[PDB]
Amino acid sequence: MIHFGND
Amino acid sequence: MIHFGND
Amino acid sequence: MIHFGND
Amino acid sequence: MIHFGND
Amino acid sequence: MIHFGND
Amino acid sequence: MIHFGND
Amino acid sequence: MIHFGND
Amino acid sequence: MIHFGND
Amino acid sequence: MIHFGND
Amino acid sequence: MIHFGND
């Protein structure tokens, strides 16, 4: 997985 | 998965 | 899956 | 699936 | 402007 | 403007 | 401006 | 501006 | 996994 | 500006 952004 | 954005 | 946007 | 937009 | 998607 | 989609 | 996605 | 994604 | 952003 | 991602 790749996440660009805040949790 | 790829997520561009906040959770 | 690919998501452009916020949850 | 591909989603352009917010949940 | 708001863009959900690639350029 | 709001764009849901690729350019 | 807000951009969710790659350039 | 806010950018979620690569240039 | 790769995360660009805060938890 | 805020950038989540690589240049």
- The angstrom resolution of this structure is 1.6
CA-to-CA dists, residue B7 to A6, D7, I2, angstroms: 6, 10, 15
State the nearest Cα–Cα gap between G7 and chain B, in angstroms: 12
Contacts of E6 in chain G (CB under 8 A): 5-7
The set of long-range contacts for I2-7, using a CB threshold of 8 Å and a minimum separation of 24, is I2/A1, I2/A2, I2/A3, I3/A2, I3/A3, I3/A7, I4/A3, I4/A4, I4/A5, I4/J4, I4/J5, I4/J6, I5/A3, I5/A4, I5/A5, I5/A6, I5/A7, I5/B6, I5/J4, I6/A6, I6/A7, I7/A6, I7/A7
Q: Confirm or reject contact between F5 and chain D (CB < 8 A).
A: yes
Q: Are G4 and E6 in contact (CB under 8 A)?
A: no
The CA distance from H3 to E6, in Å, is 11
**Residue C7, SS3 per DSSP:** coil
How do beta strands E2-4 and J2-4 pair? unpaired
Experimental method: X-ray
Q: Write down the residue that tokens 């996440």 correspond to.
A: A3
Q: Confirm or reject contact between E7 and chain C (CB < 8 A).
A: no
